[PDB]
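User: Modeling request: complex.
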Amino acid sequence: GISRDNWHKRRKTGGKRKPYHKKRKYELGRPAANTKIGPRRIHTVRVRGGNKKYRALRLDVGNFSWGSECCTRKTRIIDVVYNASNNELVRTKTLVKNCIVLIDSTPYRQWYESHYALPLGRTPEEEEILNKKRSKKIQKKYDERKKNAKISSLLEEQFQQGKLLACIASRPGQCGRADGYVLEGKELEFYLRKIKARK
Amino acid sequence: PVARSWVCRKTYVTPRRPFEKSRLDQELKLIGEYGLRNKREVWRVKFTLAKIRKAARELLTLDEKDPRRLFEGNALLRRLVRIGVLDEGKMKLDYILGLKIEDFLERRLQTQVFKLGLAKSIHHARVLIRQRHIRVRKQVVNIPSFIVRLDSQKHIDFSLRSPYGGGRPGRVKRKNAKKG
Amino acid sequence: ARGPKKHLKRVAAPKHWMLDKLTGVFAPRPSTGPHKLRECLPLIIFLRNRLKYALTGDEVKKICMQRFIKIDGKVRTDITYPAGFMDVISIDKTGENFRLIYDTKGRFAVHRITPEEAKYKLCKVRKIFVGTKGIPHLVTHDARTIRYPDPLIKVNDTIQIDLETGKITDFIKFDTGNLCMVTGGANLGRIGVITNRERHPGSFDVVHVKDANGNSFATRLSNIFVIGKGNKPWISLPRGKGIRLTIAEERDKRL
RNA sequence: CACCGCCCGUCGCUACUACCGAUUGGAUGGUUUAGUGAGGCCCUCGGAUCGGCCCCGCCGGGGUGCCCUGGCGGAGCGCUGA
RNA sequence: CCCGCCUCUCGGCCGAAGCGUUUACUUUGAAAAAAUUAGAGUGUUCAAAGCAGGCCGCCUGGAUACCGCAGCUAGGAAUAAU
RNA sequence: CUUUAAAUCCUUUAACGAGGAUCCAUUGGAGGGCAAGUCUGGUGCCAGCAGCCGCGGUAAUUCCAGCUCCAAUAGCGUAUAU
RNA sequence: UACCUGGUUGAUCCUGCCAGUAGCAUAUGCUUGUCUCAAAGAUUAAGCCAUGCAUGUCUAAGUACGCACGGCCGGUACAGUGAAACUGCGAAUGGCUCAUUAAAUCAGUUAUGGUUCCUUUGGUCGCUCGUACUUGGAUAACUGUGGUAAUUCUAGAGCUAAUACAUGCCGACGGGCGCUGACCCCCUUCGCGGGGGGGAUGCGUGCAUUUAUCAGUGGUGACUCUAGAUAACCUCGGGCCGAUCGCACGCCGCGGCGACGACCCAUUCGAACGUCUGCCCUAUCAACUUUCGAUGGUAGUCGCCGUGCCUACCAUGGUGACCACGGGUGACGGGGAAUCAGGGUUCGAUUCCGGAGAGGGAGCCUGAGAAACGGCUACCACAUCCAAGGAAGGCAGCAGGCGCGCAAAU
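Assistant: Request completed. Predicted assembly structure:
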């Protein structure tokens, strides 16, 4: 089939190599999973060893992590903006490892409103988790944890638009999942520079 | 894949110069003395003495307290004193090389039946052995090249089923003792 | 070969099984088991060639399916089950017990043990790790996995287990000054007291032993099996007691 | 064979060998530029056919089809799966 | 033939231990598939072979050596390069 | 009998089985190399032998035959790789 | 036993080759009484093949309503022996040959800290806080109707099982730990104030899987190991959390001995990919390799995992008289064989190991394991039967015949 053997290619000196066996099954390679954005469709491939390899072909949800405050919740996946390997993996919305995606970021703003008291990204029933009757003892805890509660500008300016930039850290062609992290810190400045220059 | 053994060797070496008159003279003298049948029976004894002398000629270039010398020289001289061609006092490795080829021809069963008085000539001794008359301590031996080591050299007798031994004389006399 | 092998020819068998050449083409392949293929005795060899309780190969099967033979106190119906290096082979119809011990030529001996002695064995501990909410495990050289060991036990130690239960009674730590037996290479079977270990990063470690005669050898660290504490052996030994005599003194003893 | 010695070349005689061979003559296997390209496998569709739900005649009967299983009926891209 | 007068961190009168320009050479030691080849034992009736067999249930063999080169190791430091 | 799945062969043993012991050993050789004819008949540079040197043209030490012998011996002769 | 002999001349001493001499294997000629061992279609044609045969399997312990036999001294689920078919496993080892293959194979060596592993043997299997006194639908054997000239072809009708295919709770089960904390109570309740102590209600929980942080249960030469804590993910093509079966029989509800089972971990047979060093002849092959992969970098896809294995972008490298690259080989490699004073030289298809292939090439299904050919799908090539509509092929398995041959068995 598609083979990933070592013996169909020339030596380090550059001479040809005549083959001494045919293609075996431990040298197989299979055609790719161009995982697009859509409703969830996963086939499983029975592999050498008897185990399963989960072949994702469409995904709209992944488990993404805001690592600075250790809050990992499951979000939608909206749009891809960048890929460091190929521009045709941007215009065809193909999800591979280490692409740059757009996520929905509503449970992150929901957790930021729930753990701390301060708002993010701006209805009295949601004021009933923002502004409600408390004792003085629990508000001593809430007024303690507002000191390190100022979040940096480069994420907060996109919480106004409701889409966090995030990068896939799992391999969606072997395990069928799209888990990853959100871009922060220096890496957010780098990748905003590269999307700013790639158009 | 078979359950076999193919291990064999040849036990004589044909001479290089085939028609040298001195070689023909000495080996024909050994044939006529010791009652051998053909020259291959001489060359086989030359091959076994040559293998013995090659073993001693290999051991003699060693330091004399290397333990291969001290073990295998004692084993080789013990086998040569056991078959009788090297006498009991002179068990030193330099006395292997003084073996003549007539030592192993004296210890054959044919020559030890002629020298122990059990035959009237040496050719009578070989034709006595080959007709199942001679036994060595209750084993009836049909081999004229049986080399008698000296804990079997003592027991050489006629058979218990032979006419010159115990009884039941042969078909010639019992057809002859029917006259009427 | 497109898979595993299932046969083993007679001339490619181990030398220490002492097989013939002309009885047949094949040798019994040991089953997959606790012990390695070059380092074991199957039961069909041990009952047919060493003890001569059964002459042909069908009678070893007629012995073993009557639930007669215990290997380590467990009834074993496979005739090619591997056993070796203090498997306690116990036959209860005749009341005998055997422990597989290398004699000093390197071969598995018929060496008989006491009926009080056959409730224990020794095991070299090869791997120590933790697991699954901090449960410490211990892996012996015959692949017994024991949970909850003594926390002083480290790699290359010898423990003594109860053959009914499977639990550790006591252990020996690896040192100089312990008596030792080799399960090994060219010095297989020699018994002596340990004098040294030279420690190398990245390679096999060499352990120097001194015998009861005082002649010394050294082997790799994966070949060293501690028998006892001090110079006190914890098992019944073969009759030569592991002293290798040379070919000169072995001929003089046969004289 | 000892100068009445020996031997060299061209040409014509014989049989045997290899050569450049007029021939764009055939037997053949490799590596190939370009065009078509069976078939397996992967994806995107496909949806013959079969099953389940749901609608009601089948049952005054433990409540006077009022949960009751009994026999169901036949259209419903119905509502959904293989 | 062998050692001695003429390195340092420190562990129960220092076994243990911080390390010193490299390598070639040599000598020991480990690991080196059996079968074959030298080879020990043993009267297949001798032998080529074989791994058996022996004594009136008992005793005992199924050794050993070499396996070049490259790799590994601790002792030597003439001869040779740096 | 014994062997052996069941036969065979070997071993054990009972009856027959040797004068010319017709129960009849062959293959290459006799100039040198190379152990062995300076024999008797034929052919007369023809037939042929000859690995090489050579023998053959009417006393052939070599061909074709007989006798004798002489290597090897249940074997030896020839052809090719080595 | 480290060896020589005839041949250039009228004669001699030499360089020198021819011929002799001895092994050894392949054939062939003439010959033949015994007995123990014993190679045997490799050489040319890895050319073609008629026929039989070479892989199947049932225990006390998966499923029997076949009277196929048969007990019940006869009245109830089934005695028992059991052909068949379903199911499970094996068919991937063994065998045969040497055609390709000259840093490839292979050998010693070292590594997986870069991966998988059916089976055996030990560990684990009330750790999970959320109809069960046992659930559903079928299809075979069997009965019955047939097609086709033709096959180990199978189509319709009627039955009935499961350790086949499914769907699924109960118990442990009192709780525990993190989260959220309306509330109660004791502080120095002084005037803002103020340190603890229980805690209502609600949320998530174990192992496997995927990620993202914080810390330093044991070991390693060396981890980004193993373990533990936190916030979460967990695939409809779906991860474990037992709906199975036999024997012994009971104790006042609770049970013993087993065969079978699986998420996982271990090690057992291995396999796969790698390190260092070693291969016969040729210069009438001295320069080769390429941006469509030649050497390297980064990010991926893919794989069982490491990597140009492959795709994208970028760098211009890599090997070479210490013989690359190209060609030859009657070249499988090695353990080994015949000769041999020491050195060498030559041979090794061949019974052990390792590789490769089943006419030439491909591509796949199942499976733990295959690029399987005593499996399938085509193409090429050659061949058999035919009702010319179609059907089936593979001896380099044992014997056997064709053919090629000097040259090989029932």
